[PDB]
């Protein structure tokens, strides 16, 4: 029997679950912050 590792070195990243969760939260936060700030700036412009 042959065992083929087609994983591209992913096994060498430690604490993979936490690392990927951190990446995901980074992205989600950036998106949400930017959206909220843009909405508030637009509303301030529309009232002023």
């Amino acid at each position: 029997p042959v065992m083929a590792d087609l994983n591209g070195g992913l096994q060498f990243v430690p604490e993979l679950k936490e690392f990927t969760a951190k990446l995901r939260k980074e992205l989600v936060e950036t998106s949400e912050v930017r959206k909220a700030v843009s909405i508030e700036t637009a509303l301030e412009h529309k009232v002023v």
Binding site: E29, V33, A36, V37, E40, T41, E44
Partner: protein
């Protein structure tokens, strides 16, 4: 009367309360140029803030203001 250059107004606004829950609220508040904290490193997270402001305005006509000052 239409002599709006002689007119002005002063209103004591109701006190407003905000419960800062998420980092989104902190980010939005820090975006507003008028929101100024003496301690730039203050931790707004899970804090209750109260705003007690006064607005002084002058007029250019019935519909528009010629100067606005909230503090």
């Amino acid at each position: 009367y239409t002599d709006f250059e002689n007119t002005f107004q002063k209103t004591v606004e109701p006190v407003y309360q905000m419960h800062i829950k998420t980092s989104k609220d902190i980010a939005v508040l820090r975006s507003k140029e008028w929101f100024q904290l003496d301690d730039e490193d203050f931790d707004l997270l899970n804090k209750t803030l109260t705003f007690e402001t006064e607005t002084e305005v002058t007029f250019k006509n019935a519909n528009i203001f010629s100067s606005v000052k909230c503090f």
